RNA sequence: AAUAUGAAUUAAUGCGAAGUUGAAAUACAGUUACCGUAGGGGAACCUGCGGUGGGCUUAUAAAUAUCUUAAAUAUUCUUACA
């Protein structure tokens with residue numbers, strides 16, 4: 001059985017929500033309700049099978065290449081992504097419930113701001129945030145996820161997913177919406193991706209992708225509607241990126257010590 | 258008539274030494290042995306008929322074998338997680 005993880009300072013979260021982003025009702029929808037909804041569906045889908053003993057991140061990797069397990073993949077991807085989003089927007093990862101700590105001033109580290117300049121042609125963090133808000137509004141028509149990811153070449157770049165798209169495995173990033181029209185450049189990217197997946201010799205037709213997320217923003221209606229409303233998702237993404245917990249985001253960047 | 262004794266006369270058998278004529282039995286003993294019975298032969302034995310195993314249970318291949326996430330996941334784990 002997959003159970004909803006306990007969050008630090010949960011009593012505060014159920015009373016005052018997440019300050020500057022979500023209210024108490026908004027956080028109950030995104031985490032206490034939706035995370036319960038996802039975990040229960042995952043348990044029903046995976047109970048009695050070998051996947052029941054694996055964590056959601058491992059389930060999505062195991063099932064990423066199986067077309068008829070997409071339902072399990074979607075549930076595992078959503079569960080992992082939601083706790084990636086709830087973790088970097090959380091007031092404090094440490095449990096100051098008995099310490100009553102009200103001073104958590106987290107700021108981008110030097111390694112993060114050095115990789116931002118290197119990967120974005122000298123752009124500042126503030127400018128990159130504006131590009132992230134723009135990318136979300138023009139690339140994610142409906143539900144999806146906004147990620148700041150790091151690849152095998154030490155370069156930070158921006159990835160957007162439609163519905164439950166994993167950042168780890170490029171064949172399942174779901175960054176192109178094929179319901180609408182696509183340019184020849186987008187079709188080239190899809191055609192090149194298909195060729196890479198066909199070069200793999202494995203009988204499971206799986207490739208190696210070492211991309212890892214650094215920041216996760218939930219773009220689903222379960223996270224913003226109640227507090228911002230239809231059409232105000234760009235005001236929601238702005239608040240999230242301005243109130244990130246950088247103790248978690250800094251720890252996601254590999255240092256090598 | 259019985260019992261006992263001796264008895265002309267006559268039958269069976271044991272042991273002892275010790276050669277002779279064969280080689281019947283014990284191994285598939287060189288023809289499986291033996292049981293009952295009959296006939297035959299210097300001698301053991303041979304032959305016929307049925308029976309027995311205390312002789313053959315001593316018994317030992319015409320072969321062909323299959324698909325799900327090989328791993329950022331199993332393989333590690335030291336009373337921890339829950």
Ligand SMILES: [K+]
Nearest residue numbers: 281282288290
């Ligand atoms: K004889």
Ligand SMILES: [K+]
Nearest residue numbers: 291292293294
């Ligand atoms: K006889």
Ligand SMILES: [K+]
Nearest residue numbers: 294295304305
């Ligand atoms: K006879």
Ligand SMILES: [Mg+2]
Nearest residue numbers: 280281287288
């Ligand atoms: Mg003779």
Ligand SMILES: [Mg+2]
Nearest residue numbers: 280281282286
């Ligand atoms: Mg003889």
Ligand SMILES: [Mg+2]
Nearest residue numbers: 286287288289
């Ligand atoms: Mg004989």
Ligand SMILES: [Mg+2]
Nearest residue numbers: 297298303304
């Ligand atoms: Mg004769």
Ligand SMILES: [Mg+2]
Nearest residue numbers: 305306307308
């Ligand atoms: Mg006979």
Ligand SMILES: [Mg+2]
Nearest residue numbers: 283289290312
């Ligand atoms: Mg004999």
Ligand SMILES: [Mg+2]
Nearest residue numbers: 310312313315
């Ligand atoms: Mg015998």
